[model samples]
Target chain A: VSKIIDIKTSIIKIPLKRTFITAVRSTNHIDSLAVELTLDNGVKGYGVAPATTAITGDTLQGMQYIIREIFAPVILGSDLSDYKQTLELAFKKVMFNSAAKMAIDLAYHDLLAKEQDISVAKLLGAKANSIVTDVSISCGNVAETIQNIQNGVEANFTAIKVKTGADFNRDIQLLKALDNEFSKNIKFRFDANQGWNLAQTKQFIEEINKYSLNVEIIEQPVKYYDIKAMAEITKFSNIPVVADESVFDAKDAERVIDEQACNMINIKLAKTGGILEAQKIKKLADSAGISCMVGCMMESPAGILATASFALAEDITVADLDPLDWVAKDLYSDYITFNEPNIILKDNLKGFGFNLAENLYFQS
Target chain B: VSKIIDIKTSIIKIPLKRTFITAVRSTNHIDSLAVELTLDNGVKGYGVAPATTAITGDTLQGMQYIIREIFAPVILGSDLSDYKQTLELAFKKVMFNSAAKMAIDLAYHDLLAKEQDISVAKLLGAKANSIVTDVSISCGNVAETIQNIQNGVEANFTAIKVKTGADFNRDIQLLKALDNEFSKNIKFRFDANQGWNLAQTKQFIEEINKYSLNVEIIEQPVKYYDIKAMAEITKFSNIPVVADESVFDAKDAERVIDEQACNMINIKLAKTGGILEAQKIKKLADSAGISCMVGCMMESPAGILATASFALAEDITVADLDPLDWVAKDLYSDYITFNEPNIILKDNLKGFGFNLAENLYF
Candidate 1:
């Protein structure tokens, strides 16, 4: 029997290439908890969860404690033959520790995929090995944001996701700068992150229309709980409204569908707990005739690799797996790369296909 | 670190005192899959899931296969101190095996309560040790139905639940007979189990109003998927509608509340996966200004005990947990007893409170 013999956790802080800002929070470094599970046969699996207290309510120390004190005891010495049961046992009675749960879940999937001698994508019945992603320009001053867009363009990125809703007029100015510089070719997606009221959302849309900006989608423009307002905006706007903060779990997705709130949904593995629950949300969204975009937090290769695998799955239409590019150095081997706007998984890579660097692992 | 060293499955077939009938199906025996988890310390916890294909889609053989082949390997040799992680591992990658999931969930809770030296009710922070329950009468002929009601009365049950909607006219006649006989005293709850259309439901409610039959609630009178029709019935009819077949999980409850479909919800652990998900549904329903009723299938004392524990927790408004009365043999000792209409738990019992009779265990 393949049994998990040991579990180890390490915290790593990696500086970003540039400061990433959103409506809710801003950060200069990606701090995360890295989890390694070792089997009796000495086969090890790696997973990482970014410590973002603003979004997932998990800190580096909290994730470390949960994995070491709470999750390790449940997972160690357990047989991995029945991965479903093993993962379920690890999550029982636990609520809202998505980051902690994601680490264990990813590790479980990693080990299982390796056991089958296949890629995690192949294990999940991936429809494609490559995904096209949108590069995100963090919320900033007009000059900084324009410079970021120019950098994205210089890097040959075709699609861009612009974070807005911090200031309506400043956001409009940023949009105007994008339109003036590169509106003819580049595709744009705007994410308000539940930062705008209905009137501001409408006015922004009106401005986008007046300028005829090549905007592809508007995401989470209103409050998360106000589905009625979301529906009104979706009905009123020309652009498709994609739900981010409003659609966290499958039930939330169902509520969105039932309320006719959004045209698309954004699936973040951390928000939905893990891949298992993320798959459930995808299925629900698909059944309701809704497409989904796979997004992620600012994470290292371990977390990004898992998100990239999800993007490669069938029926996911859009990819926002761009956070890894912001990191100055990824502790694990690089198995994913951005070819212009496309996020490509390395050919023939198996089971997430990256190994953690030994020096990067803190000796406890 | 306490580890789960053994997992066992047993099948018990107890003949029913009478054939239980609903709009969907009927059965004469209670066939269930009982699961036992043994810790390394030799403290055992018990759980059971009835093999009702009509409701939970889990068969006796299916439950047995999942427990032995699927659930055993993961749980065996695993530590139980982290029940949250342990249960999550048990449920990972599995979808819709609610009955099997429930058995494991209950066993985990049972072991934890024992380890804490508290009753499962107390472990769940129950507000009371007892709950008032309504005795159910299966859909049958007027004479048989009346006989069941008379038996409940003789047993001092003040609340009665009647199953109907097989035949509209026959159901009306049964209701008329009930109004003629027991209208003055006992409170009545009628469940159609998604058997009627809007028109039929409206006509029946009209007749009940004309006759002034005292119905405390009307449950699932229309189709399960037709939430608008249910809302119409809820709005047009005088009786409060309790959603049973329609509201299976927290998501379903959310949809019901969003649509303003029904006035109340019925929580069955089997339908909601387990106590974990059921508690979510209850909390959601309670927040939406909807009261709730705790109901069950024709399960033995093992499953009923868990349901009773849920009812004893604060906020559950109604109890239809009288299925154990339909079984000829319970296969376990009774920790829950009915004092007239009230279901009372033994005060000092701990951790689900009753053990399985070894002879009755296969």
Candidate 2:
């Protein structure tokens, strides 16, 4: 039954633990969209979306318009039992506003699971309620990256995604510094953010192999549309390459996988339009025996939980829920807590586990 | 060199031996588009597109416009070595005019293969150069259907695709008649053309099973966009279900596969936009351990060879190339021949192996 009566939103800005810098973007703060959906039965389900305007082109203002002006009217009076139709009706009218669509879609699933008093991940048929995640070391000047790496290591995060592709020689120096300063047991995921060409990617691979480094995956080392170059690298490189921006949807995944462009896919909820669409990508990759990384950008605490729930619902190969520092510590301290690298779902939590404080909801 | 100098067209009307009727349509003749492409190096590549306006919504007139006005200009001066770029430029401008797109794309690949002096199938890396195909028996009254089966039976075809879905009772009667008249060894592929509901499909399955009929797969029994119903039937049915019109492209294939909607896929070049796009679908199905049927519409003999070339290049599970009696015997008699149920590509066939007669080219 769509008895989905109303949906309202809240905006929150959170401080980052450090300056999060990639080849394409840098930020010290995160602007998030918090969605609270109300069912006619008086159950309220909550979800979150964080803007990655550079990556997904979903600005906070744009997401708000799509959610209120477009999605709200189509979804307001529908039956949740026919959730697919409700979703299709709301989304079919819009183009590529994935982050906004994700907020509404997550809220819908939350309502469906809330009606049954089950976790959304459980409702999604994921038997495992907990998942392990890798913390990211954003590309920074050498000293700052070392400090970031040191913090994650001290916090017991065994996997570190080292951001690269800005400067090749510096990237090499950073890798040597990483091994120089850290334990050999730590796994490394190198993300170039489309900063390198085919030759640089080949050289980086050669460097990692020649040095006996523990670099596990090279992500989007070349430009997204240069699928031929990616295939060439995949054919020659010892390290597995992950297709990130190379695939934004199922069609891209089909082309990349069809061309043997990469050994893995980095699936982000923000880029895939919604959780189910991302799941569609995951299924195709898994069918090909290709692994996927459930990755994130600068996201909210509740948004990270929603992301974690999706990873929990399936047999995910890897996860990078990424980093965030709660702006109002007292507000979200009890909402989520990091116990090293693992995100464990509490037994009492249900429906995305994003029940927010009553004060956060402004009825208007 | 992209240097695709010119692309011209021909229109042909081929008479069918009998009326071809399905749940959705009936036809007595086929209208085809024959494309002749010339390269700067004095090489020529040929391709064909038959009107399946009822299915794909690509009319011969519409295809002509898209080919000459849309695809031709984008492709003509471009480098063929940058074939991917050439294809992207031409196709990216249009949306889902798959049949028209297929003819142009096939011609492009044909030119590429001819440059390398290899069969398009060989260029595409298929170790096998031949494929077996099933003949189609259009839905008809019991006696006419019996005679259609008799023709294929005499032609030594092991597999027959029977059209159904007009009436459930008649469909059952036809199934009974099929078993009574046909040999027990022949495999039956029943195509409903999205004419049945969940109940009728279930009933059809029950009848076939109760009689122990040798039904191998059921093709598109329910309407397209009813993926949930398709999944329900796939979960319960003993016979495999093939997704036909349910999937038109990679995005559609992704949704159907993600939902576990069917056990197999029916891939036609006309529906897939081109050979490479169809190849993209085939790879996904194969990765999922799902089978695929390389099917055809009312295409020319040369067109059928191109379709056969693609199937030959891959390890396909089934094919329904349907039936055709050459319209102009002298035009393409030397180009292709039906050897019982198999389409055997001789070593002499290069590129798509569709080099037409000098007069046919004009």
Candidate 3:
């Protein structure tokens, strides 16, 4: 019986190659909280919780405190043979601390998969070892937006997510430009980040239909809390509406499905609190005939790998696990290889299978 | 230099001397989540987070998980020299685990007070070391209600709280009987627990005014979330209105005061996440010229003692810290002595001034 002997937490702020902008906020650096859990049997598991305060309400300081103060004591000295009990003990009674909880959850999964000398996907009984992922283009001026799409095209990315909702007219112009440029070759999705009202969303959808833009789906056009408004937009528009912020956990997913809020659900590990709860959300969405798109917060290679493991474990219809591509200075080595639009997992890599470089040290 | 070395948590279900009833639920026993934090200096401080799921949305099982899993590792090796940072670290980014956070907060405060060899009140700059408390009479039929009141009266409790909201006419009739029996001698307070609507509350207040009942205030007569309705009742009624469930934290207190929703605010440590945040709520209420009442969930002596320390530290207008009076098998020995309606604190006792008896093992 292997018992957890120690745990260490660190925070790293990595500058982005380009400024990542969304509807609500923009940031130059992605702050990530990394964890290393060591067991008595000379084995260690690594995980990362990237801070996305706007979405998960978690901060670097908060994640550090949670890992060091809240999770470490309860997990320390526990028999790792009962990893299920370990996960349960990590969350215990806590609520809404999903980002903090996910880091620990990922670490435990990594530990168990390593002990079994098998991949985490095999451990989870995953059927798919690779997933086709879409690269995101942040909201920018028409020229900058076009340039980012051209870059993605040069890299042979087939599915592209365009960030919009800064201005409806400009966004429409950009969508028409993308359609005119690569409509037949590329599939497009738009995420409004809950920045548009029902009227605005309807107008944009009308423009997309009028211009015959190859838009596959529209995500979270209205406010996160306004499920009624989301349902109205979904009903009124031709594009399949995807619920991102509107659905946080299984309860929120149930409400969205019950209200027919959207045709698709965006499942982020951070929002669902971790893989266990995220799995529940996916099952609920599937039962309701709603497909899921596995998404991510701003993460490093460690976080991206953790999310990719989940995407590979389940039969998700779409994947948005490419935020780490924006990082100019990712401290960790790559575990998931990107082959154009597809993310490939090596059959030989064990657990989540990412390692931090020896030269990397956090600068507080 | 006083580093926390160990933390222990246990659950105790103490049978209530009388069944406790409220607007939402009723229970025959009080389930308490008790915590004990020990320091390297061989000193220990005890605290309890009593579970009243109706009020705080916390359960015994949940509380155990929070203490053991969420709090223990983060706080175990920390030095108590900086207690404020310790409290902030305890909560960190978590939301709505107030009861779990309060249990740890109370334990830290107790640890610091004991380290200083001073009472928690003194460490908090308290003016009084004791407070006059009100005993609660659970809602029941006329005979059971009268008997409960008689028990309070016989125990020399001058102020009595009568729980209502199950029935309107029946509640009024019970109040009238109490007024007829002991109106001039004993002061009375009514807690509707958000069980009545605007019209019902208006009619009840009108009757109280008509009968000249010796009533001090009415608490949470309407829905907890309906601030406008509560303000309307406060405006229309003759007696002062107190906000109980309406004010959970400092932000809630500020909103109630800014809206002039009620004349007084009930500040419970469990609701505010413990004394640190509770102090902030008290100051906000005081600055707004709104008096405050220190209240409690159904607690044993350990939880009550933690709350009483706060009441003693500040000039709270009223005290409803008598849930322990309903507890028959209290697990801990008393630190605050009760002389009729008043709880007296001895000068020499340190920290929150309460400890588990040698025979008591929670």
Candidate 4:
């Protein structure tokens, strides 16, 4: 039977006071928003697409239109079971933007996972229930960064990912401070985000080796353009390079492997468009005998849970599941009560494995 | 209208005398067997595929089978205008090795250009008649290496590609020797083939920077599989890294570019299949704003001429054309007459822009 269904969306706003180191914030309120969808089956699917203009380019109206107008019509009356075809249709018909695609895709996947009564990870074939994630402390004063690292360590983060590469002295100082505090007890990684050139890159690496710092890897210390230069560096350095901005798709990963360019690859659904493409990239890396980590932008619990589900299906070494615990209150109507900086999934929950409060109205 | 024609092959053997650097030497003789194909129209096409067991996996027997049993039968009935299609068809149907493939492809291209009576470069879009090439000196003692560099300078070669990265101290000493000798007169490049680690990589770079050695670039100094380490080294080092073994095809170049893994890409025709694929790789590198060098494996004059003709079409910043100059004499009665390393083409020359003496026979 062929039937067409109409769809609409509404925005719900949530506010945060301080700029959550883990979550996005400005001088005023947090002002976060999500998109809610109503389908022909009378089933409602809600998605929170976090918007912090400073971090990403998405806005509340942008998120709402993405769900209500851009994606909804094309997806109406579509076979709910044919998730892959549905995404293909959306890509072909609608404007190609990852943020929007993720919102719609998230909602659709969430509803579909619910229909099967299994966690998203199980549905995606992830065998592991828990993934070891590294908590990131943004670029800051050495003392403050150390405190943040200690806090994460106390909260049981297996590894720490520090946002460095902006300042040479400050980043070195931060590493020294952490070394002084932990003294070989912690695993640390620095992300330069292409901040350093050749000279600074060498100095920082030499220091890491000299200090006997247990650095698992460094990410994009230089600009992502010169393959020969990068290969030469790899030939000489003790620290391994993990490519984040360097990889966009499967072809990019294949190139990296073929050239012996980087040792590790960082996989983010947002950067790769969605889970399907990201999975292809992961498999390619795995085939080449390279390691991979699944990461995310500052997402709510729902999004984090969704990501967590996907993470379980693959053999990911690290998971960046920070902002989720910080912004739990904004995600669910009756949020699963969890301690600060510590996220524990409830035992035996169903359909994304969480229950919403009764007053949870479909906003759209 | 379709016509069937019978094609026959003949061999022209060239026996080379000395141990040519980058030239494949069998005992004391450097032999390259040229395959000549006679069309039913009585017009002839000649291709030389070098048989150096060390450099190329091609043997004389393999070249004979490739030119006769496999390539001749399929090409005899095919339309001549469909050059690209014909090459593709041969590539698809024939199990020819890279050397054999190059010999046939070059021969066919040469034949087509002659039939058209145009410069092979013109047919392949070459803008320049002459190209600057690098004088490659193999890894050796300080004196010998210096003498080699001095020889290249005397030969008017603009650049010198020194094979380094075997032993750090010796490699460093050779650089020191050259820097002491040349000053700013020559451009110097070192190819490590991925032989160093991060510490050693940084040390050499620091030395180069500190001494103002004029080391223009370093090629594959460490293990090929470590991109992160490479990126870190690239971030820290003073020299630009040119990837050689790391890049196999066009897609490989893209990753290196995307990852900022290399500053330059070294493209060899054999590594990338042929001239067309090499052009594609160069175009991809050019689009990404990365430097491209036209590189070659050991080949005879014909192979070098064909490759050099193709390289002329693009903006080739560097070239490794060492083997082409070593053909001093041959068993083949028909030989390319050249007095120096730069095989100059006359104003009226057509098709490859060079003449093949009729005395060339095996």
Top DockQ prediction, candidate number = 3
Each model's TM-score, in the order given?
A: 0.55, 0.51, 0.58, 0.47
Tens-place lDDT digits, model 4, residues A52-135:
333333344444544565456667777677668777765543222344556666666656655676655666776656555677
In model 3, pairs of residues that clash are A69-B74, A70-B70, A73-B73
Ranking by lDDT: 1, 3, 2, 4
Candidate closer to the true structure by TM-score (higher is better), 1 or 2: 1
lDDT assessment of candidate 3: 0.78
Q: Give me the displacement of residue B87 in model 3, in angstroms.
A: 25
Tens-place lDDT digits, model 3, residues A131-210: 88788988888888999998998878878899988777788788668766786668888999888888889888887877
Candidate 4 regions exceeding 4 Å error are: A1-33, A37-39, A52-59, A93-96, A224-233, A328-344, A353-364, B1-362
Instruction: Chain A TM-score per model, please list them.
Output: 0.94, 0.94, 0.94, 0.83
Cα shift from native, residue A331, model 3 (Å): 5.1
lDDT of 3 by residue, B237-309 (tens): 8888999988988878877887789999998888888889999998998899988988988877777777777
Error of 1 at A43 (Å): 0.8
Q: Native-vs-model 2 lDDT?
A: 0.77
In order, candidate lDDTs are: 0.78, 0.77, 0.78, 0.62
Best prediction by TM-score: 3
Q: Rank the candidates by DockQ, best first.
A: 3, 1, 2, 4
